[PDB]
Structure 1
Amino acid sequence: STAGKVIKCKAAVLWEEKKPFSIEEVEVAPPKAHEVRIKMVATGICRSDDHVVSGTLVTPLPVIAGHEAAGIVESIGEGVTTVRPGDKVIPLFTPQCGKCRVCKHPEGNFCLKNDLSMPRGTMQDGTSRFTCRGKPIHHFLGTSTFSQYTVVDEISVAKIDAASPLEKVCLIGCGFSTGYGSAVKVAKVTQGSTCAVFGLGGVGLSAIMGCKAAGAARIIGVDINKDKFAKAKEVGATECVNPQDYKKPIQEVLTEMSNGGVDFSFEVIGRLDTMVTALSCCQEAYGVSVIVGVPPDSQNLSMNPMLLLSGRTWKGAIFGGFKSKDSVPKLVADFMAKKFALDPLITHVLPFEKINEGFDLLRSGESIRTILTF
């Protein structure tokens, strides 16, 4: 048995920014009280993982990244009550402690135990379960899914359906649930409305899916890579526009196309300029814009508050506004019942050992989601 013992396994360690991951042996400590050690089965490559490499997102290095994944519980620490060895689980990069003011609020999901706002790169107890070359290695968002085995706090894992296909439902751990929730829960897109989605990667595709599910009459996809347009239309976009095709700023184009501004817009890229453009393109009196993209570290946007004074609503969200631990199992159940599709997001499959090729695919513009198999 491996229970109570250190596990030696392979992980993808990031030693330095702007460098390939190093696939090499790490030591994974056994779970402490209220901790869960998970044998990973599949993990997706999300742009936020790439932000760690690029320094768009600052988190302590060296690190084991990865936050969109699914696996099987190997062992549980003392006091764990919500999962058992052998359960299928999704790590929760946004925890749900159930006890803080946000967890208790009907509309909050950004649990105060998160490691996103001011990342420490640790477990909840401020220590690391990972050693590599005798050196401690940081965690990422409490999940660190780029490893054959990880350890997570109990508040950062959800039990899911035992019959779930883990190579698909890993996307519920980030990109799908984020985009879909951003539309259905955060924006509360309405029947017959006009939507604009900026960025047609896995998360923006998922936002399109949610807009369509909510009954939007028009869904305008916006991307500078026209190769993204065919799949955006397959999942519900009614039209697609490339800002590079136009002499005028795209907020003006979108305001014209929507006869005075869109009902709902979504920034699903991570640029300061598109955040302001996306706000501006929604109708000035009653439009809603949602920021989903992750901006470059420590940078401020500039905007005219008259955009808001007229009536616009501007909001953002992590993980589609979903209370993570309550929502993930339900989302998996709904997937199993064919209430939404995940295959449109999966463009490439690779073994974990080819993680760097997976990142190359994302950076080239070729992929949506590459799913890595352990």
Structure 2
Amino acid sequence: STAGKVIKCKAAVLWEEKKPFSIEEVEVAPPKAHEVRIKMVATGICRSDDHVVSGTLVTPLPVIAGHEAAGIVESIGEGVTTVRPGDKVIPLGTPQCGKCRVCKHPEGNFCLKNDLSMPRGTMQDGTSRFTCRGKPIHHFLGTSTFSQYTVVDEISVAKIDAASPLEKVCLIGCGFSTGYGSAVKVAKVTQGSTCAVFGLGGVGLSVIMGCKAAGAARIIGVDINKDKFAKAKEVGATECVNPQDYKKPIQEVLTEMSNGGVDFSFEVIGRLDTMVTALSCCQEAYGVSVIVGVPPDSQNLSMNPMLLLSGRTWKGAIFGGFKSKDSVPKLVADFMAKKFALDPLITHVLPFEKINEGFDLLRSGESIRTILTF
């Protein structure tokens, strides 16, 4: 019926920065060799998608954004061996080619086939599968899930349990796994430790979930929006602090609260100043700080290297350190076995056609994750 043919469908096209998405018809080419065309079922609104709109995260425009999603395979290109039509799948904003030095390394996950370091906004072959008004449109992170259909390279898609609820497990494609893995895999939070989490959105709440799963004794949530505190406590925060409530810098406050610095801190906002504050608030001799938030494009932070010389460890990670294709199906299986919850992250549900309202909810501070249904 549609296999081998161009599909005309609706997508949310971003023609320029700082403008609403345009819901309009696009043409989606059939998949070439080692490509997969997916009928989207649900997609979450991640702050990184908003960073594309705001220019915080630079990728070529015009673009179909979206990268946190789940759908059903409509057709596969020649040579595809890991998914078949009808399979439930999660696209992966970080691929897993399985062949590069990073994929072969026991710890690495930032596969060298990624489209983040030097963005092209294309498929792996350097071309686009999307046309709109006769104009080629860029892809985003090899995923482009703000469309009723997308085409992704095989290395950027994972087959998941056929019974998965796609309107929930789409969060495993980005925000949940990123936050959870940042705590359990990247930081390796220890039982009885004290953690500080800067930023209590969908990703920060998932960091809290991971800290609690790791057995932290104290988990201090930090946010300038106190409306975020109730949910943070529900998922495991033992206390929350708003930096605006204090006359001293919050790194001082947190050092005093933790009797000399926290064991693990996480920056899950995307500001240069909070990256330095989060590093400073961990204990100077043995603390660990993990950057999760995305900094504004091309901007440098300033910091005193004595913060590191005393013994601190500072690291960052994409996607919680998880090797994407290996990890996503296992994380879905864990979700199906009730080993973590996703409902606390989902505050709003909207049809895809209301994407702009979903972004308004995020920008106003009212939502954690809005899930869009196609």
Q: Secondary structure at the match of 1:206?
A: helix
User: How many Å separate the matches in 2 of 1:120 and 1:316?
Assistant: 23
Any idea what the Cα deviations from partners look like across 1:192-211, whole Å, max 9, x if unmatched?
Answer: 00000000000000000000
* Count of residue correspondences: 374
Deviation at 1:160? 0.1
Q: 2:368 aligns to what?
A: 368
1:320 aligns with 320
Partners of 2:118 and 2:236 in 1: CA distance: 36
- How many Å separate the matches in 1 of 2:173 and 2:106? 21
Question: Once the two structures are superposed, what CA deviation does each residue of 1:67-104 show, in whole Å capped at 9, x if it has no partner?
Answer: 00000000000000000000000000000000000000
- Cα distance in 2, alignment partners of residues 162 and 58 from structure 1: 35
- Structure 2 unaligned blocks of 5 or more: none
Q: Which runs of 4+ in 1 moved over 3 A?
A: none
Measure the CA separation in 1 of the matches of 2:165 and 2:177.
16
> What secondary structure does 1:240 align onto?
strand
Q: 1:238-286: per-residue Cα shift (whole Å, max 9, x none)?
A: 0000000000000000000000000000000000000000000000000
Q: Distance in 1 between matches of 2:298 and 2:97?
A: 28
Q: 1:293 Cα shift? A: 0.1
Instruction: Supply the distance in 2 between the matched residues of 1:131 and 1:68 (Cα, whole angstroms).
Output: 22
Cα deviation code 1:7-47 (max 9, x no counterpart): 00000000000000000000000000000000000000000
Distance between the aligned counterparts of 1:250 and 1:326, measured in 2? 38
Secondary structure of the structure 2 residue equivalent to 1:371: strand
- Structure-2 separation of matches of 1:81 and 1:309: 49
Q: Distance in 2 between matches of 1:154 and 1:110?
A: 16
If the length of structure 2 is used for normalisation, what is the TM-score? 1.00
Give the match's secondary structure for 2:128: coil
Measure, in 1, the Cα distance between the counterparts of 2:102 and 2:21. Answer: 35
In 1, Cα distance between equivalents of 2:223 and 2:287: 21
Taking structure 1 as the reference length, the TM-score comes to: 1.00
SS of the equivalent of 1:231 reads helix
Corresponding position of 2:2 = 2
How much does 1:134 deviate? 0.1
Distance 1:67 1:275 in 2: 24
* Residue 234 of structure 1: how far off its partner (Å): 0.0
Q: Which residue number in structure 1 is paired with residue 80 of structure 2?
A: 80
Equivalent-residue separation in structure 2 for 1:321 and 1:117 (angstroms): 16
**C-alpha offsets along residues 299-330 of structure 1, whole Å, 9 cap, x if unaligned?**
00000000000000000000000000000000
Query: Partner residue of 2:172?
Result: 172
Deviation at 1:118, TM superposition (A): 1.1
The superposition leaves residues 212-257 of structure 1 with CA deviations (integer Å, 9 ceiling, x where unpaired) of: 0000000000000000000000000000000000000000000000
User: For 2:252 and 2:174, how far apart are their aligned partners in 1?
Assistant: 32
Q: Distance in 2 between matches of 1:117 and 1:48?
A: 15
Deviation, structure 1 residue 146? 0.1
Which structure 1 segments of 5+ residues have no match?
none
User: Which SS does the other structure have where 1:207 is aligned?
Assistant: helix
What's the Cα RMSD here? Answer: 0.2
SS of aligned partner of 1:349? strand
Equivalent position SS for 1:273: helix
1:91 matched residue in structure 2: 91
